Amino acid sequence: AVQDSNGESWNTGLSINKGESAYINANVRYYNTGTAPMYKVTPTTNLVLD
Amino acid sequence: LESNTAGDPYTDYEKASGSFDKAIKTEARDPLVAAYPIVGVGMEKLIISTN
């Protein structure tokens, strides 16, 4: 006897890391309301969720 | 016989006259009290990110 068989297949996956699952990009903009200019502005900012 | 009676960086004349920094308390202006800060750290909450 002779047997002939042929086919195909498809696959798709998705892997996620639960420690770093996204990256946040924030657009900020400084301003001055005082009296003198400040050169080399180096501010520190927080990011609170709840 | 000393220029820093209390051991802090400012001398006797600087402390007595108040010629030192203006953000240090008045009680520090006598020579026998040291202007030595006490800084501590206090935790408020902890966040765990499972990997």
Task: Describe the structure concisely.
This is part of a larger assembly, with two copies of chain A. With 50 residues, chain A is largely without helices or strands. Chain A has no helix or strand.
Protein architecture, described:
This is part of a larger assembly, with 2 copies of chain A. By secondary structure, chain A is largely without helices or strands. Helix content of chain A is 0%, strand content 0%. The termini of chain A are far apart. Chains A and B meet through loops of A and loops of B. Chain B: Ca(2+) 2 binds at residues 2, 12. Chain B: It comes from Clostridioides difficile. Chain B: This is ADP-ribosyltransferase binding component.
Tell me the total number of β-strands of chain A. Answer: 0
Largest interface, counted by CB within 8 Å of the partner chain's CB = A-B, 4 and 3 residues
Spatial extent as radius of gyration of chain A: 28 Å
Shape of chain A: rod-shaped
Oligomer state equals: part of a larger assembly
Q: How much strand of chain A?
A: under 5%
Number of helices of chain A: 0
Helix content of chain A: under 10%
